[PDB]
Scaffold this active site. Structure first.
Site, PDB file in Angstrom:
ATOM      1  N   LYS A   1       0.801  -1.228   0.000  1.00 29.40           N
ATOM      2  CA  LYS A   1       0.000   0.000   0.000  1.00 29.40           C
ATOM      3  C   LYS A   1       0.836   1.281   0.000  1.00 29.40           C
ATOM      4  O   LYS A   1       0.372   2.326  -0.463  1.00 29.40           O
ATOM      5  CB  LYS A   1      -0.976   0.019   1.186  1.00 29.40           C
ATOM      6  CG  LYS A   1      -0.326  -0.163   2.553  1.00 29.40           C
ATOM      7  CD  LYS A   1      -1.428  -0.480   3.566  1.00 29.40           C
ATOM      8  CE  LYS A   1      -0.901  -1.264   4.741  1.00 29.40           C
ATOM      9  NZ  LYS A   1      -0.526  -2.688   4.365  1.00 29.40           N
TER      10      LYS A   1
ATOM     11  N   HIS B   1       0.387  -2.701  15.226  1.00 28.04           N
ATOM     12  CA  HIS B   1       1.005  -1.622  14.497  1.00 28.04           C
ATOM     13  C   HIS B   1       0.897  -0.397  15.401  1.00 28.04           C
ATOM     14  O   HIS B   1      -0.214   0.026  15.740  1.00 28.04           O
ATOM     15  CB  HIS B   1       0.302  -1.372  13.158  1.00 28.04           C
ATOM     16  CG  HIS B   1       1.126  -0.565  12.203  1.00 28.04           C
ATOM     17  ND1 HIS B   1       1.854   0.537  12.600  1.00 28.04           N
ATOM     18  CD2 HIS B   1       1.379  -0.723  10.878  1.00 28.04           C
ATOM     19  CE1 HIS B   1       2.487   1.050  11.557  1.00 28.04           C
ATOM     20  NE2 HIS B   1       2.204   0.313  10.496  1.00 28.04           N
TER      21      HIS B   1
ATOM     22  N   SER C   1       1.687   4.640  11.856  1.00 27.48           N
ATOM     23  CA  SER C   1       2.521   4.861  10.680  1.00 27.48           C
ATOM     24  C   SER C   1       3.415   6.092  10.897  1.00 27.48           C
ATOM     25  O   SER C   1       2.928   7.153  11.297  1.00 27.48           O
ATOM     26  CB  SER C   1       1.641   5.002   9.432  1.00 27.48           C
ATOM     27  OG  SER C   1       2.431   5.007   8.252  1.00 27.48           O
TER      28      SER C   1
ATOM     29  N   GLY D   1       5.822   1.181  10.602  1.00 31.32           N
ATOM     30  CA  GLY D   1       5.998   2.456  11.294  1.00 31.32           C
ATOM     31  C   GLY D   1       7.389   3.053  11.150  1.00 31.32           C
ATOM     32  O   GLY D   1       7.552   4.278  11.193  1.00 31.32           O
TER      33      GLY D   1
ATOM     34  N   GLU E   1       5.884  -5.562   8.993  1.00 28.38           N
ATOM     35  CA  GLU E   1       5.167  -5.089   7.813  1.00 28.38           C
ATOM     36  C   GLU E   1       5.638  -3.663   7.441  1.00 28.38           C
ATOM     37  O   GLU E   1       4.826  -2.729   7.442  1.00 28.38           O
ATOM     38  CB  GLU E   1       3.655  -5.073   8.103  1.00 28.38           C
ATOM     39  CG  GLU E   1       3.067  -6.399   8.629  1.00 28.38           C
ATOM     40  CD  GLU E   1       1.714  -6.205   9.338  1.00 28.38           C
ATOM     41  OE1 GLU E   1       1.310  -5.042   9.606  1.00 28.38           O
ATOM     42  OE2 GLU E   1       1.040  -7.215   9.626  1.00 28.38           O
ATOM     43  N   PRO E   2       6.945  -3.490   7.125  1.00 29.47           N
ATOM     44  CA  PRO E   2       7.434  -2.143   6.833  1.00 29.47           C
ATOM     45  C   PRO E   2       6.934  -1.616   5.488  1.00 29.47           C
ATOM     46  O   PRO E   2       6.959  -2.352   4.495  1.00 29.47           O
ATOM     47  CB  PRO E   2       8.968  -2.322   6.786  1.00 29.47           C
ATOM     48  CG  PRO E   2       9.170  -3.739   6.410  1.00 29.47           C
ATOM     49  CD  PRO E   2       8.016  -4.500   7.006  1.00 29.47           C
ATOM     50  N   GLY E   3       6.495  -0.356   5.457  1.00 31.14           N
ATOM     51  CA  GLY E   3       6.195   0.291   4.189  1.00 31.14           C
ATOM     52  C   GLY E   3       7.251   1.348   3.925  1.00 31.14           C
ATOM     53  O   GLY E   3       8.118   1.171   3.060  1.00 31.14           O
ATOM     54  N   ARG E   4       7.188   2.434   4.691  1.00 33.19           N
ATOM     55  CA  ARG E   4       8.018   3.619   4.415  1.00 33.19           C
ATOM     56  C   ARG E   4       9.512   3.373   4.592  1.00 33.19           C
ATOM     57  O   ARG E   4      10.315   4.083   4.003  1.00 33.19           O
ATOM     58  CB  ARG E   4       7.576   4.809   5.268  1.00 33.19           C
ATOM     59  CG  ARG E   4       7.718   4.581   6.769  1.00 33.19           C
ATOM     60  CD  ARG E   4       7.277   5.792   7.563  1.00 33.19           C
ATOM     61  NE  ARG E   4       5.827   5.954   7.589  1.00 33.19           N
ATOM     62  CZ  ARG E   4       5.162   7.006   7.096  1.00 33.19           C
ATOM     63  NH1 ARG E   4       5.812   8.011   6.507  1.00 33.19           N
ATOM     64  NH2 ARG E   4       3.839   7.055   7.187  1.00 33.19           N
TER      65      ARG E   4
ATOM     66  N   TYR F   1       3.838   6.793   0.318  1.00 34.12           N
ATOM     67  CA  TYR F   1       2.488   7.392   0.316  1.00 34.12           C
ATOM     68  C   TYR F   1       2.445   8.633  -0.560  1.00 34.12           C
ATOM     69  O   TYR F   1       1.908   9.677  -0.165  1.00 34.12           O
ATOM     70  CB  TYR F   1       2.015   7.683   1.758  1.00 34.12           C
ATOM     71  CG  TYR F   1       2.104   6.443   2.623  1.00 34.12           C
ATOM     72  CD1 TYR F   1       1.188   5.407   2.463  1.00 34.12           C
ATOM     73  CD2 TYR F   1       3.120   6.295   3.579  1.00 34.12           C
ATOM     74  CE1 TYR F   1       1.268   4.244   3.220  1.00 34.12           C
ATOM     75  CE2 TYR F   1       3.211   5.127   4.352  1.00 34.12           C
ATOM     76  CZ  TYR F   1       2.262   4.104   4.158  1.00 34.12           C
ATOM     77  OH  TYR F   1       2.310   2.929   4.881  1.00 34.12           O
TER      78      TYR F   1
HETATM   79  C1  PL2 Z   1      -1.301  -3.415   8.636  1.00 32.35           C
HETATM   80  C2  PL2 Z   1      -0.220  -2.408   8.205  1.00 32.35           C
HETATM   81  N1  PL2 Z   1       1.033  -2.854   8.017  1.00 32.35           N
HETATM   82  C3  PL2 Z   1       2.032  -2.052   7.656  1.00 32.35           C
HETATM   83  C4  PL2 Z   1       1.810  -0.696   7.462  1.00 32.35           C
HETATM   84  C5  PL2 Z   1       2.983   0.214   7.058  1.00 32.35           C
HETATM   85  O1  PL2 Z   1       3.156   1.376   7.797  1.00 32.35           O
HETATM   86  P1  PL2 Z   1       4.585   2.094   7.531  1.00 32.35           P
HETATM   87  O2  PL2 Z   1       4.638   3.420   8.387  1.00 32.35           O
HETATM   88  O3  PL2 Z   1       4.599   2.565   5.988  1.00 32.35           O
HETATM   89  O4  PL2 Z   1       5.748   1.216   7.788  1.00 32.35           O
HETATM   90  C6  PL2 Z   1       0.518  -0.147   7.653  1.00 32.35           C
HETATM   91  C7  PL2 Z   1       0.307   1.369   7.433  1.00 32.35           C
HETATM   92  N2  PL2 Z   1      -0.840   1.905   8.165  1.00 32.35           N
HETATM   93  C8  PL2 Z   1      -1.617   2.811   7.279  1.00 32.35           C
HETATM   94  C9  PL2 Z   1      -0.749   3.961   6.710  1.00 32.35           C
HETATM   95  C10 PL2 Z   1      -1.627   5.194   6.402  1.00 32.35           C
HETATM   96  C11 PL2 Z   1      -0.767   6.393   5.969  1.00 32.35           C
HETATM   97  N3  PL2 Z   1      -1.665   7.361   5.312  1.00 32.35           N
HETATM   98  C12 PL2 Z   1      -1.239   8.385   4.577  1.00 32.35           C
HETATM   99  N4  PL2 Z   1      -2.136   9.203   4.000  1.00 32.35           N
HETATM  100  N5  PL2 Z   1       0.060   8.610   4.404  1.00 32.35           N
HETATM  101  C13 PL2 Z   1      -0.506  -1.049   8.040  1.00 32.35           C
HETATM  102  O5  PL2 Z   1      -1.779  -0.612   8.261  1.00 32.35           O
END
Ligand code: PL2
Ligand code: PL2
Lengths: 369, 369
Positions: free
Chosen positions: B47, B175, B178, B215, B250-253, B350
């Site tokens: 995402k 979590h 974020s 996060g 579950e890293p995104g950023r 994002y």
């Molecule tokens: C289940 C789950 N796993 C991993 C991540 C990953 O989180 P990160 O900080 O990228 O490592 C997220 C992000 N939570 C919604 C993120 C909304 C941010 N919204 C926005 N408009 N930027 C999540 O919901």
């Protein structure tokens, strides 16, 4: 509407995506109402509010004109079969390539509020007829526009003189009090200020003839004439002459009631008497108005409940990962169940145009009735 | 990066804003993840950035996936990734998405509600479940706690309910929110996770997974800071030292942030009483939604070379007609001119995933280096 949506669901039992139910006839009736409320004002529909191709065709056929914000919107309107002569490029900051495109296609009426924009016009679209946008705010408008757009009173003469110097034809004055305005005095004061700018333009040597009163008006139905009566009084007080053409740039007036948005309960959680529901829609899908216009919308249940049904405290969540994505933080409703459909009335303005595919959601169908 | 972007512009004499994306950067960060977190298998949050080259880079470097919807599962499956590498890490999943997940072999998912367990039992009874508990970082950029995660008082009930339905609970997730820079939040969350883990054992489940969620930032000063990882690893040692436990995240950023820069051009300009206002071919409805949702205040890098040159107070506006659409309200910069390109560093998280076509804008290109 409850009956129509229910009939759609029965006819399409495998419907899964959220869906808009849109009615051209509603907009046709409202165009007829506009003609009565504002007999002197030619509407240039703000395509940005809802660019649904059936809506645009409906506008086109009812002799409504267009306010386009970009080359993409110009293309959309042209593809419908509208003459580019019917378009005002009503964005004071236009890319050079969009200006070249506008000139080529025949979009030759546009707005400005800066000397640098006049430079661009001179170089790339020298015969574009220009409308000076002045800043005149409604302090109670839902979405404020004043900081970003519109010339201040103290630069009006300078900008008009600069246009004259560059052989740019200034044909009128526009303003936008703000999106979602219910303040009639704001329009009155704006039209008065516009007459003063009109008079400066004449003084400089321009021959203006257009007043553009911008957007902001709701079609409030209980159809109310509080806004229109007072706007018409201002038109009479300051622009009585039949030599002046008056136009407007309404978006939400026509688009709001065009559609309802139907969405399904896909998840549920009940904790200590609070009923939390998750829908196959979100603030990143069709519900951005919850964020940007402080909308607090209440859904209509499609399932019939008895008159004495107990209402429970409910929270309506969007389908995304994000904690900001809450459709309604608190609303009393009959208990809902996974699989229940609801719809949100009057969901046609700044709704579908703002869809994202964030989280892989954002899909929707459209049914026309 | 400055010369790279200038090279792209010279090679493509380019109109739209564009991302410049570097798979190498991500490959290096993956190698760093393995050093910082030798026990933790990353499941990349699609995402955050679903760019196809990025997903393929993840795939080839043996990184797994966190998918939030059926669309996201599709994106991962279609690049040849084994469904065994996917966690459906959304606690609220539509029945039809569960049906799809079952079809594809996506057999691990999270939950935080009894109704979710009902759906699993009916539609994906073989799915191995991870209970998501609420554990907040109150200083996280985007809060998630309100909307997701079981409260402490319902953990035992939820585990017993899964057991009654013959549903296998294989672990615990959280979590903290974020965009987290609070190491204490993770320590407490992992402590709470071990308590939930023990409740699961007490109920009769045989859990083996700890999922520490997302996060984290890859905060670099060319060395990555271990301010978060050291304490996370300390918590892992204290609470989950057993080698029989599998740890995931579950890293995104962490991976996406530095993957891209976003280049955009000055298309409009207005100078009023010493304040320099610029309009770009990008917006908060395009790639700058983080200005709204994460309170980002980004400073651009100029591509035009300036002498060691007076800085002036500048306002960076997005291209839409909305007053909310301001990229940066106040920043000191050398004077810019219509046609100047700038870029915004670390613009991969994002950003592109949240594009809209509002006002007919939102289009962009992507170049890979
Ligand atoms: C289940 C789950 N796993 C991993 C991540 C990953 O989180 P990160 O900080 O990228 O490592 C997220 C992000 N939570 C919604 C993120 C909304 C941010 N919204 C926005 N408009 N930027 C999540 O919901
Ligand atoms: C030049 C111009 N004309 C007409 C309208 C029409 O305004 P309406 O109230 O629909 O009649 C607008 C809307 N101004 C940006 C509005 C952003 C609203 N943003 C949002 N996220 N809802 C406009 O900028």
């Amino acid at each position: 509407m409850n009956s129509v949506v229910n009939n759609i669901l029965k006819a399409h039992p495998h419907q899964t995506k959220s869906f808009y139910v849109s009615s051209p006839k509603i907009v046709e009736d409202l165009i007829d109402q506009w003609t009565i409320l504002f007999p002197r004002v030619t509407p240039h529909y703000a395509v940005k509010c809802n660019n649904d191709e059936v809506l645009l065709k409906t506008m086109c056929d009812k002799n409504v004109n267009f306010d386009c914000a970009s080359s993409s919107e110009i293309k959309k309107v042209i593809q419908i079969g509208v003459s580019p002569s019917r378009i005002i490029f009503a964005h004071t900051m236009k890319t050079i390539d969009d200006l070249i495109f506008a000139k080529d296609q025949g979009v030759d009426i546009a707005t400005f509020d800066s000397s640098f924009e006049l430079d661009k016009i001179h170089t790339y679209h020298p015969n574009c007829k220009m409308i000076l946008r002045i800043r005149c705010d409604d302090p109670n408008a839902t979405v404020q526009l004043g900081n970003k757009f519109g010339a201040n009173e103290d630069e009006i003469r300078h900008l008009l003189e600069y246009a004259k110097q560059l052989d740019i034809e200034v044909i009128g004055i526009s303003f936008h009090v703000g999106s979602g305005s219910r303040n009639p005095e704001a329009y009155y004061r704006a039209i008065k200020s516009s007459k003063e700018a009109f008079n400066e333009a004449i003084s400089v040597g321009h021959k203006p003839y257009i007043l553009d009163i911008g957007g902001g008006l709701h079609a409030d139905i209980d159809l109310s004439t509080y806004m229109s009566d007072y706007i018409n009084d201002a038109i009479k007080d300051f622009f009585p002459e039949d030599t002046v053409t008056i136009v407007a740039e309404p978006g939400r007036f026509f688009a709001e009631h065009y559609s309802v948005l139907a969405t399904q309960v896909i998840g549920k959680r009940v904790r200590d008497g609070l009923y939390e529901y998750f829908f196959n829609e979100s603030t990143y899908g069709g519900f951005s108005n919850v964020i940007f216009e402080k909308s607090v919308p209440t859904p209509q249940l499609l399932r019939d409940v008895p008159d004495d049904e107990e209402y429970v405290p409910s929270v309506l969540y969007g389908c995304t990962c994000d904690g900001v994505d809450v459709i309604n933080h608190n609303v009393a409703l009959p208990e809902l169940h996974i699989g229940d459909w609801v719809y949100f009335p009057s969901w046609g303005a700044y709704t579908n145009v703002l869809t994202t595919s964030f989280n892989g959601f954002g899909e929707y169908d459209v049914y026309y009735i």
